[PDB]
């Protein structure tokens, strides 16, 4: 029924988001893995007038991994598309950059892929 | 956050105007020199508002959806990277640009690259 | 029973490979999608003495998309790990670079992810 | 392929020694300036042996598994990119470095980055 809602990825992380009418994404993210506890703020953007040819809806969002419990000195961005229908899905690739010194910048950024559905594990 | 807040440019000639809020928010506008883009687009992101002080960069990211009130490319870019302060301040990034596609074309939906932003004295 | 064998990904592409004793990967790749027809040469490397703690076996390979039928002026590399067991798997991320002019180099490289099993679709 | 064949260096100070064969093969050795690496490692890859002549680069890629007869990091890097010829020849790449991990740690198995190689007059 749209991007707004509660989503879960293959790791069991929880992505709670609101899609504003003109393209904003606002919500919270809780990771099942990594140097993370509880909810973190997220903000992003999506295409609020997608094509009408069967294409997905492009979108992205960011989490900086600082909250009242922990600070991992890192940030993840997810870039992907929403695919509607009977089992809606958000398919993403992500980049997780840690703050590093300049000599260690070559090893600053992890890459991966997450797929989200509204099915609670 | 005075470091991040300001006007920046990348190696393509694109314009990144940003404000860093006390709460970790990034807000501003982006103008790409290339691609299916014209004029300014809204951006929004997050940064580490209490970064290490041990000679590490400050982790940050932001998103642009490539729709404005003049054009719509049906696509979105996210930049993930770090701010390196000082007199020659830089934001070093890698990015992912996803286009909306049909399911059959989803394998070719996402471009990857890297941008380096230089801050400009206001 | 090891890396050597015939593998298929989620697109239905066919990856036929031999793992040499000292780390070579040699074989052919046939893509189900894109500017591709029939088999293409591949070469790569793998860790020929993996850890003994339950970790996967790191590996990578390259295809340049030129054969006797077509030339797409492009190359893909896959980087990932082999995971043995009852349903062995190779989990990868890939980079597909097309030859471009310098002004268009920003849009030269696609990224994605392929998972391979020995199950024939 | 005289263009690609030779000795190259990247911005980290690493050494890439390669031979480009008539059949599209790349063979050689790689020496990283950084990471869990010492001495030379075998590489192997492929390139477009009949590239466009319209002012485009030549697509190529290669792999190093980080095991040699002195060290084993249980990891592998692939570089994907293009050769740009002429008097100031470059190979511009992006790379993926996958470490062997347990299944629980697989989400953090892969680093991404970018290297630019400069050819050195033999
Ligand atoms: O360890 C850190 O630096 C903070 C937590 C990172 C968790 C990552 S973000 C990408 C991937 N998807 C998830 O749901 N969790 C991991
Ligand atoms: O073509 C599109 O879909 C929209 C414009 C994309 C421009 C990209 S975003 C990554 C890179 N950095 C820039 O400043 N511009 C390009
Ligand atoms: O279109 C091209 O330039 C050549 C074919 C590319 C096919 C790509 S490689 C990554 C992905 N995995 C596949 O099995 N096929 C596509
Ligand atoms: O630490 C490891 O697992 C092995 C060494 C990895 C070195 C990486 S490969 C990408 C980048 N470019 C280089 O020349 N060195 C680093």
Residue A11 is nearest to which of D96, D107, D111, comparing CB atoms? D107
Interface residue A60 vs chain B (CB under 8 A): yes
Q: Is the CB of B108 under 6 A from ligand 3?
A: no
Resolution in A: 1.0
Q: Establish if D50 touches chain B: CB-CB under 8 angstroms.
A: no
Where would I find the beta strands (DSSP E) of B4-107? Answer: 6-9, 15-20, 25-31, 41-47, 58-67, 72-84, 90-99
**Cβ(C7)–Cβ(C28) under 8 Å?**
no
- All domains in chain B, ordered by first residue: 3-120 (2.40.128.30)
Contact (CB, 8 A) for B47 and B60: yes
- The span from the CA of A7 to the CA of C49, in Å, is 40
Query: For an interface test with B, which of D78, D92, D112, D116 has the most B Cβ atoms less than 10 Å from its Cβ?
Result: D112
C5 touches C25 (CB < 8 A): no
Contact C43 D49 (CB under 8 A): no
Compute the distance between CA of residue D79 and CA of residue D99 in angstroms, rounded to an integer.
15
- For residues C42 and C17, the answer to whether their CB atoms sit within 8 Å is yes
DSSP three-state, residue B90: strand
Which chain D residue shows the shortest CA-CA distance from B112? D94
SS3 string, chain A, reads: CCCCEEEEECCCCEEEEEECCCCEEEEEEECCCCCCCCCEEEEEEECCCCCCCCCCEEEEEEEEEECCCCEEEEEEEEEEEEECCCCCEEEEEEEEEECCCCCCHHHCEEEEEEEEECCCC
The whole-angstrom separation of Cα D84 and Cα C100 is 10
Cα gap A58→B22, rounded to integer Å = 29
Q: Whose alpha carbon is nearest atom 9 of ligand 3?
A: C76
Among candidate residues D118, D120, D122, the one with its CA nearest the CA of residue D92: D118
Is residue C106 within 8 Å of B34, Cβ to Cβ?
yes
Q: Please tell me which chains touch B, using 3 or more CB pairs under 8 Å as the contact test.
A: A, C, D
In angstroms, the Cα distances linking B39 to B15, B36, B65, B116 are: 10, 11, 13, 20
Instruction: Please identify which residue in the block is written with the tokens 């980290």.
Output: D12
The answer to the question of whether D66 is labelled as a binding residue is no
């Amino acid at each position: 029924a749209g991007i707004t809602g509660t989503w879960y990825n293959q790791l069991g992380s929880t992505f709670i988001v609101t899609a504003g009418a003109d393209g904003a994404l606002t919500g919270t993210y809780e990771s099942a893995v990594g140097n993370a506890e509880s909810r973190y703020v997220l903000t992003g953007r999506y295409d609020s007038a997608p094509a009408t040819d069967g294409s997905g809806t492009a979108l992205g969002w960011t989490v900086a991994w600082k909250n009242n419990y922990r600070n991992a000195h890192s940030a993840t961005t997810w870039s992907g598309q929403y695919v509607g229908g009977a089992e809606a899905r958000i398919n993403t690739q992500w980049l997780l950059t840690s703050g590093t010194t300049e000599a260690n910048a070559w090893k600053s950024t992890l890459v991966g892929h997450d797929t989200f559905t509204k099915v609670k594990p």
